[PDB]
Subunit: 388 residues, 4 copies
């Protein structure tokens, strides 16, 4: 086997094609399916896997009541082949209420985080063995990506932060070889607050579009130099803006340098990737709630301050349906490396009240250079048929 | 590994031997089994798999109500080893309310179709990656085979149509190498309307017996020249006739050239294959409803206009039991390549009314050059023990 | 890979050691477990598998009612690793209400029989493909081994019979290479009626201890010469006698040549194997019912007419618990080839009446040349906790 | 493949990092999960597996009532990948109410014990085949490790005892090559009573910290010389003491040579391992009940009589939650061999009375040379949501 070095042009894409949907909540009304959240899909050199943070219970289980809480000792990283849902024969790969997994070519690395908020611990499991660990540097919820990490020539890099949610925080980018933390680099550049990076290889670097939870609606950008371990950060140029809350397109801005300060506080995990000076990105259709999901290209979206010229829009989940987190993943193709994304469709509390649980299903699309039509692929569960 | 080129004589067969039955509906009254329809089985060079379009739910689930509808965003192509039923650990290979899968020797290709009726999109997933896609050319339900596609020396060919159901439509035959559409050829020859082809290798070509939904009871024939990408189409000569509705054998005809216009409209997916000037084929025993299933050889059935000389008949499902779609699949043997078939036994609505769901189970037989006896192998579920 | 030629001395054994138990009926009162009967375990060169004829349903299913019947179109041969029970993800390898499976070194062969009693059909599935078939020669329930077949240098041999149950019948021994019936040899020698052979390699031959359903309580012996395809048959010498009904040891006899005519009619599948002039064998503890199971060596049991000198007795299931069929299986060891056996513990109707189903679990032991103690390992299900 | 010879320095560790948790009891209130006890995890050269003694039933099954009993004929050794829980597709590897499993590099060895108390039998299954067996030498419950055995260069060694619980007993250490008992060595040295050894490679020897059930609260030490088959035994020096009941740290002692006679009788399976003259160990937080679990280093804990200097303490399960058995397991690292441990969290009777079953879940941690924080990871099931 050899290590992945991702040195292939990004594929030219026209938009996104349907790829998978696991239908976990519809199935949960007639099956023993895990309660999850924060899903992501990462993919080894032969096949893809879907991951999620389980709540240590199944939906038709009395223990599903009050699973809105993001951190309990019973959360484990579930790992399955993309498309097979989280049934009882699913493997719990590690204890984690925050994770990132990636494969370096030769084996999988999982960074799982559990523990006390104020004194959490992160374990670096590589190829089955626990090879390293690190404790909470700012005593306030050590967290990471919640989507795939990326590895070039042996080194994987994950970005993690500990600190305030909506306040300044301490973000560091760890570089790790075979499970072992070989370097830690603090965040440098313009970004004010990094939460949940959606990173992707951009040989010879890695680039991430993260979430700004303090002062923005525009999304942070974190650039990692795998050779010097140098970090750089910015905001995505596009005036169209990916976070939720967001202003609305008439009143929204980004100057590529600072948090725009328009409905800053909070976010939702999202992604975007550059294509020359253009930007492919996705966001909720709502600017207040995480409902609906749409994708489009923004001409000049990457390189020009405030560019709002959209084209190739696609609705992935209509505005009357719920979405959640979203992240990117890259698959090596024969000729180029493509970009794909998943979108979490959360259901349950607090928004839907009939039931007392909170869980999600996923839908995933991949870039295509061919043609496509139209559609909307929501979760599909009728809330009145669910248990609880 | 090397690519399949299927250059081996067709095996001489005497009739059909029992091969598999998964018992999905009997099992569904005491287990969490997927609701499906449009099953097919395709087979890689070491083993066989059964496929079906799931309705994103299990039978003992309130979401199974009203699964008669053929297209919803929650349908996925399920794939399992032949004989293991669609339980909750089954993989959903792609989003699809229409499909065709085949293996070129080196990996699997799946063509999955989802989307809006009027603007559907087809993704070409090969070896795990999404390698291509195509949008609806006639804005009216892009559809394909619903059974195995076939590949010779690297190129796979699927036939798809977009257009009217019972009216003229636009049928094209796509040739694809490693997931990539490398050529599209429109339907040429005598056939008036192609729906659901049951194709099979006939080195160096591929031959399909499809469904004519507009003007026939006799079945279309589509011949693909893998070297020039030339298409040709006809109708099966046999006066015995494979579609349902059908006239009855006294009053039925086929001249090998045109839709016979005897109870044309509608169909059911079926198959047939040639053997010299003879024809092996199967059909429902009923000519009105898709009930019972029988197979037989028709002497001169392939080459002579209206030949109705039957021999070697076998009942696979008695006339008092339901059948559904049927299709062919080919398995490479040591000496020759054999032909086998599956027959979908649908249950539920609209025909059976106690329950509110619609689903199927399968039974599959393979050609044999040996001896065999008699039997009838229906679905078996007692409708009064089923949920709903 | 290479073919198995089984040329290694039989291991010297002292008695039997516990090996597996799957606990299917206890589990069925809290799980979706298949209803089965006629189990057997066969073993490929790296691991072992347990097989059973399923009744196309699970126990907590209304379709389990009246599963006492031995032949319905919904019976399939289930195959799993020894120890993993028949849950819903179990593969149905073929349609069969009678079977025998074995592995020639290079792949598995399964002979599955389904159909009409009076006109059944047997398919020879080898390595996934259906390679041959044969119809019922005497129009009265074609049947076979119900335990492992054995293959030496490529040729597998199964013994099958068609004819009267308790009356004369037509027994033939088929020799098959890669799924293909290459020779059929009729039964020759002293045996009057062969039903359910428990065969085992005895290089260069194969030897079977079968069931005599017409005139005996002593067990038939069938000897196959793999080189000339010559058959020979006898009765086991031992005056202790393996069938049920049986007389009792005071009044029982066998002269090694003829059916003893002591409580002839009927039987139960059993086994025995020779060791020099001695005989290792097992039988129900009851002589009327198939309850309890015991094993022992009979000094001179193989070579001397009526020898009743027992030693090394072991109780495998106490007399207050039910047993059923039993059969042998051989595993290649480093030095010698060992013999092991399974014993079906049937539960349900007609003997236990609370419930309306009939099913079994298995327990299996293997020969040992070491020491052992004592015990009794019954099914274990409390009939009052079962569904139905 | 080659045999494991474990010749690598023990890794220097700082404490323990979270590794796995399977959540079996929370899941059992909405899933068909096996009732177990005496879990352990052993690990082959590529991945790890969790093992447990099943009670031949699932929790939501009426057969789970009264599973407090440690020995019934229906107990089997369940084996799964670490993290996938004991669902119905889990393999029952052998009949056993006591076990130890290990992998020699080339294949797995399982020593399973079943039978009558007074006349039990142990089978040595290696690589699938039953290769040997041994009967009860003292006619009073033959038992073994209940955790991993260890193999160096081909020879595996398990320690087993037969005799009184709280009284003198007969302990022997068997050395076995490929399933075959090649030598048996009786216990020699200072230890008075050995029960449940937690052994680990310490090239070229093997070292075990066991349970003294007669006269101690300090833990026995058993040293095996793989070259001469010589045994030696002692007590762990530390005055801090690992058994439960225990005195309390003010009043507790160990002189490294004799049972301390402070609350001797009974125990609980535990572990400890040396590091120079220090000792890493774990124990219940309670000294009366097996509740809570803590680990720490004891400076001079290995080499100095009665050393009570603790440091690096970690709470793994808080004192208000239940624990149970605990044992060690070793994983080969790139550079050194690490030590990890699991802790059984038993639930049910006799301590919790609402329910009538007894079962456990596991949590496992591995040594780390990095940093870590704090936490408590209990079972998590709310006893009021459980069946029964
Ligand atoms: C499979 O699927 C199908 C279809 O699926 C769609 O189904 C629903 C449920 C969706 O949510 C999807 O998920 C799905 O896609 C199902 O089939 C349907 O099932 C329904 C039952 O669940 C059945 O019945 C419907 O159900 C609807 C909701 O469930 C109702 O909206 C509908 O009725 C509505 O209008 C009624 C108007 O009259 C109203 O009734 C009130 O009742 C009283 C009756 O007495 C009215 O008046 C009487 O009132 C007083 C006393 O109370 C006086 O009496 S008296 O005379 O003095 O004595 C009045 O004078 C007297 N009225 C007179 C004389 O006129 C009262 O006034 C009404 N109230 C009002 C405000 O008007 C009711 O409240 C509703 O508003 C009806 O119940 C569907 O028909 C059925 N569909 C089909 C095709 O069959 C399947 O069930 C599922 N399930 C399964 C297992 O498969
Ligand atoms: C079958 O399926 C296909 C594929 O999915 C689908 O085609 C796609 O249609 C969408 C929706 O119309 C297209 O996306 C739009 O693209 C335009 C820009 O392209 C046009 O204009 C440029 C020049 O500017 C030309 O070069 C080009 O040829 C086109 O003529 C965008 O403007 C669209 O964005 C606006 O509309 C969105 C909704 O569609 C809004 O949500 C968004 O906020 C934008 O609105 C704002 O700007 C408008 C003016 O710019 C203004 O009027 C508004 O009020 C507001 O201020 C959108 O990106 C997509 O490109 C097509 N993709 C491809 C590959 O063709 C078919 O439509 C579908 N058919 C059916 C029947 O379903
Ligand atoms: C045990 O199992 C075996 C194997 O399954 C089974 O054998 C098979 O039996 C079937 C049913 O009879 C055979 O199929 C029939 O074949 C005849 C033609 O063969 C005969 O005639 C030719 C000359 O024409 C001879 O060379 C040959 O030797 C035979 O004598 C067909 O005519 C049959 O079709 C008609 O009958 C069907 C029902 O059987 C109708 O549904 C069908 O529509 C046809 O009817 C029409 O034509 C008839 C005149 O041609 C007319 O009388 C009717 O009214 C109507 O117009 C059918 O194909 C099959 O070949 C056998 N297969 C083999 C390999 O032997 C055993 O029967 C079975 N035994 C038991 C006890 O179950
Ligand atoms: C712990 O576990 C071990 C291993 O399982 C167990 O040892 C085994 O015990 C059984 C039961 O006793 C032994 O099997 C018996 O063997 C005798 C023959 O051996 C003796 O005699 C010969 C000479 O004849 C000596 O060479 C030899 O040393 C022995 O002394 C058989 O006769 C036994 O069969 C009779 O008894 C059965 C019940 O035990 C009956 O069901 C059976 O029908 C036979 O009865 C008939 O014959 C009797 C006279 O022959 C007559 O008295 C009766 O009325 C009737 O007509 C049986 O095979 C077995 O060999 C032992 N195995 C080994 C390897 O040692 C321990 O017993 C067990 N301990 C505890 C406490 O549980
Ligand atoms: C975030 O997470 C980290 C990592 O888990 C955690 O750090 C760890 O904290 C624990 C708990 O305090 C530390 O363990 C203690 O270590 C001391 C010894 O170390 C000190 O003293 C030596 C000199 O003796 C110095 O060299 C060294 O620098 C330290 O200053 C032990 O004494 C502790 O044991 C006693 O306390 C236990 C409870 O903590 C008792 O249960 C135990 O029985 C011992 O008590 C007895 O002795 C006491 C005097 O010796 C006496 O006062 C008592 O009454 C009684 O007689 C314990 O082992 C551990 O080493 C830290 N690990 C590392 C790597 O740093 C952080 O605390 C955590 N932060 C938050 C906010 O959660
Ligand atoms: C079809 O594929 C087969 C399988 O590879 C080809 O067989 C090879 O061709 C010649 C002799 O037939 C030699 O190159 C090899 O020895 C053959 N393969 C094997 C596995 O023996 C065959 O030529 C192909 N035929 C066509 C018409 O394409
Ligand atoms: C970002 C990065 O990893 N760069 C290096 C590249 O300079 C080198 O050429 C290659 C293998 O030789 O490995 C990689
Ligand atoms: C199987 C076989 O005969 N192949 C030959 C091959 O060399 C040639 O390139 C191809 C196209 O003509 O077909 C011919
Ligand atoms: C239909 C078709 O695929 N024909 C070609 C054949 O001409 C050629 O000989 C072979 C390999 O050489 O590949 C194939
Ligand atoms: C019963 C049987 O199979 N005998 C033959 C044996 O004579 C021959 O020596 C061997 C391989 O050479 O194959 C086998
Ligand atoms: C405890 C033990 O196993 N020691 C031996 C060691 O002396 C020898 O060097 C090695 C392989 O050569 O095998 C091992
Ligand atoms: Ca924000
Ligand atoms: Ca028609
Ligand atoms: Ca008899
Ligand atoms: Ca003690």
């Amino acid at each position: 086997v050899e290590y992945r070095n991702w040195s292939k042009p990004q594929c030219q894409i026209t938009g996104f094609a349907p790829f998978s949907k696991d239908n976990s909540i519809r199935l949960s009304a007639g099956g023993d399916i895990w309660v999850t959240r924060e899903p992501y899909v990462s993919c080894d050199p032969v096949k893809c896997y879907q991951f999620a943070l389980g709540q240590g219970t199944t939906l038709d289980n009395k223990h599903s009541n009050d699973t809105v809480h993001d951190r309990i000792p019973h959360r484990t990283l579930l790992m399955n082949e993309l498309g097979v849902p989280f049934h009882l024969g699913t493997r719990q790969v590690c204890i984690a209420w925050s994770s990132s997994s990636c494969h370096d070519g030769k084996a999988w690395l999982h960074v799982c985080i559990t523990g006390d908020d104020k004194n959490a611990t992160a374990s670096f499991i590589y190829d089955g063995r626990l090879v390293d660990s690190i404790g909470s540097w700012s005593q306030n919820i050590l967290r990471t990506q919640e989507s795939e990490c990326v590895c070039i020539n042996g080194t994987c890099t994950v970005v993690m932060t500990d600190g305030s949610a909506s306040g300044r925080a301490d973000t560091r980018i760890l570089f790790i070889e075979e499970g072992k933390i070989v370097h830690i680099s603090p965040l440098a550049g313009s970004a004010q607050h990094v939460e949940e990076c959606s990173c992707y290889p951009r040989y010879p670097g890695v680039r991430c579009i993260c979430r700004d939870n303090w002062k923005g609606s525009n999304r942070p950008v974190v650039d990692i130099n795998m050779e010097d371990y140098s970090i750089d950060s910015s905001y995505v140029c596009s005036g169209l803006v990916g976070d939720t809350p967001r202003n609305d397109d008439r009143s929204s801005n980004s100057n590529c340098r600072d948090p725009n300060n328009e409905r800053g506080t909070q976010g939702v995990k999202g992604w975007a990737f550059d294509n020359g000076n253009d930007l492919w990105m996705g966001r909720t259709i709502s600017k207040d709630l995480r409902s609906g999901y749409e994708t489009f290209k923004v001409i000049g979206g990457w390189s020009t301050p405030n560019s709002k010229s959209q084209i190739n829009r696609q609705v992935i989940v209509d505005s009357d349906n719920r979405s959640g987190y979203s992240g990117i993943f890259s698959v090596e193709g024969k000729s180029c490396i493509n970009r794909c994304f998943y979108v979490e469709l959360i259901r349950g509390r607090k928004q839907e009240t009939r039931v007392w649980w909170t869980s999600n299903s996923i839908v995933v699309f991949c870039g295509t250079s061919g043609t496509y039509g139209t559609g909307s692929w929501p979760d599909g569960a009728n809330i009145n048929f669910m248990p609880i």
